[PDB]
Symmetry: D3
Subunit: 163 residues, 6 copies
């Protein structure tokens, strides 16, 4: 068969963030991770000799990671957390009525229900798909994209999209 894949991975494709998981009947304490992203795309060797240039993949991964890096990840779609702006701070109130308060600029609000590695990965995948531009990918006949997001060197989520 003639489809081929290229992938990029680097300790440099990272965002260092704080978070905590909360879902129904469960809340854990604030902590954080070096999240690391790798990207794979399946296409064909085109007339320039590439599936797609490594440098485009690297540039797009770096960009998405840079936006996330150095914040508390706030899942705005959460069904078990309440958020309030008080002065320059976002206040987070949990089901058990415990409270956090951070400067608004420390938080990155992501359209996700939970700050789990799977849902963060889904977010990053959609972002990368937009950054690389769907029509570029189609012109090169790239039909599948996969990202891995590790929350540590021992645990990772892998999400994908057929395009």
């Amino acid at each position: 068969n003639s489809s081929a894949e290229v992938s990029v991975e680097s300790p440099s494709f990272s965002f260092n963030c704080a978070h905590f998981i909360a879902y129904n009947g469960f809340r854990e304490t604030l902590h954080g991770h070096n999240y690391n992203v790798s990207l794979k795309v399946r296409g064909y060797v085109r007339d320039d000799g590439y599936v797609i240039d490594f440098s485009i993949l690297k540039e797009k991964v770096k960009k998405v990671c840079n936006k996330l890096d150095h914040h508390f990840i706030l899942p705005i779609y959460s069904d078990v957390l309440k958020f309030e702006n008080v002065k320059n701070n976002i206040k987070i109130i949990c089901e058990d009525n415990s409270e956090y308060s951070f400067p608004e600029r420390d938080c990155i609000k992501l359209p996700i229900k939970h700050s789990s590695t799977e849902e963060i990965g889904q977010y990053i995948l959609n972002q990368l798909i937009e950054e690389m531009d769907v029509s570029l990918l189609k012109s090169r006949h790239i039909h599948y994209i996969e990202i891995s997001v590790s929350e540590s060197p021992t645990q990772k989520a892998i999400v994908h999209k057929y395009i």
Copy 2:
């Protein structure tokens, strides 16, 4: 597409064992390995934000590895070895009439024909599927499980099961 995978891997998911391969017309000398196990499951992001909790996968891999660790692996289904159990020892007699004798407690008797990485993997996969409980996996809509077993950092076997 909406299926997602999670995987766990660590130097800690290891068992350090002695063994030798024996099949028709071939027997190698006793030696050993640090075997290492990584586990991946394919499912869907559930309402808790996970495919499945990383901590469940880690706890189950550690348990199966712990049972194997620090033994000679005895393939009880071998077609080319004869086994005797006299007093507190297991004697192994090979086709060329060479013999080994170990204290019975030093052996872990696996229901496999050869102590190859492939066959050890198949056994580990079945064990992990039992540990994780097949009905748990089904309630979360997990449909695929894969383990990699490395006999060293340079060589591994990958076995899977669709469920």
Copy 3:
């Protein structure tokens, strides 16, 4: 020469924490890291065949890491942060008057001036020296201890003590 070293390192010797650095005229946003610890000791091969048992070093590193894991690291000796404890929360007030508030149980209060990797390392080294018991180390003629603490796979601090 006759001195010998043993070291242990693993992805498992980790603590996943939130923090931010603050020193005179500088404050960064809340974020987090997978911190990883490796331990090395210099001694002599003793009559049991060891510098010291690897299992002792692993057990002691795991214990110290476990205490830190899953918290916000609070540097109680900070010269640029004011701390208040009201009801069940710790409030942190910075020089620029920005504020953070966490549940008290979310914080691990370390006797350090900054939550830098260097200062966290020094604290870990002192703890491990206490855990391993200085008189045990002396009876085995261990004269040097070194820990590396990485804040990510790309950056680390190395602190030591001659004993």
Copy 4:
């Protein structure tokens, strides 16, 4: 399911070469890489306990890598390069009229259009398939073979063949 994979990878499966990419309207400066090869085959556990012996895979990978090691890779099917023999040297003329000249003995002439990691991969895969002998693979019921070629630790190409 009953199919299984075995895989071999090592820093030892490398070839260190110089090259440059040239395609329509693009030429880069001469540089080099440590190319690294990993091999995976999919088959079944046979009556000897193996998908196929690891030692066969390693032996064949090392062989192909050793042929390539320590040369300038020249893509003889290039549509943007001209090659001419002058004394003991091969002269390369680019579209911009820039020129290179190397001794003949320093070039490995590969039947590829571009010295891209993708196309080098396709070359290596064919070679490996011939070295391992297609009918041996068939007798063991091996039906899929995949190689990864990395040009550095951060970027790689993955090519495959169903057989």
Copy 5:
């Protein structure tokens, strides 16, 4: 003891170059490497909490690597090579009278006798010391600096300077 070290390493701190070693009675064929650089400095925890900021070390390493990346390394102080300018090309004549010719823009002229990993390391160390500025290092009481240069994942040179 109170001195501490910080270290930075990454697949990102690389330069991908072509070269060949030539010394008395020995010349090898043109090939290439992904050279990788790691930097360690020894100093003291200062009043900001750092030996020195990781970001300064990373910034300076990347800078030096970027200058070298994607060239043929030419050792201008070679006692067994002759270099001559012809049009836009540099001609290299070896002792055996074999010849190379590259465009000028494809060579990085380094003040080294041999393009060995040792001598490239010594060059990089001096450059890094100048980039980081000797008096900044002195004001922070940094007294030792060490770089590792790997020519591949399996072999490296380590050079240092006491300052």
Copy 6:
């Protein structure tokens, strides 16, 4: 300062052996390890541009590893084990009167008291020192040699000799 170090390391510099530790009042069960060796030497950059050629180090490490690979390691100097040859077998009797019996050709008899990683490392170091030849090392002004022996990726011993 002008001394420099070169080191070689590879998953290929390995011996896969069985063993068990026995010392006074302690015996563990038969198991095994992939032992991995790395070698470092400190010297000076000589007139060929090297501290010493990487290829000599690699060749010597491979040789010593190859001799050990695929055996049970038998510490002939043990003060708590008794050995007897019975027909083609070596019988090992422990303090608790438990017994092992292996074909003589499965065992490599090492002049060490315990098959600990430290004592194996000491043995390997002396062997490597002999293989590289002390006078070669002296002519190049190499004054220090260090080997690391890991028994797994998480635990290692480091032994050295000033020469």
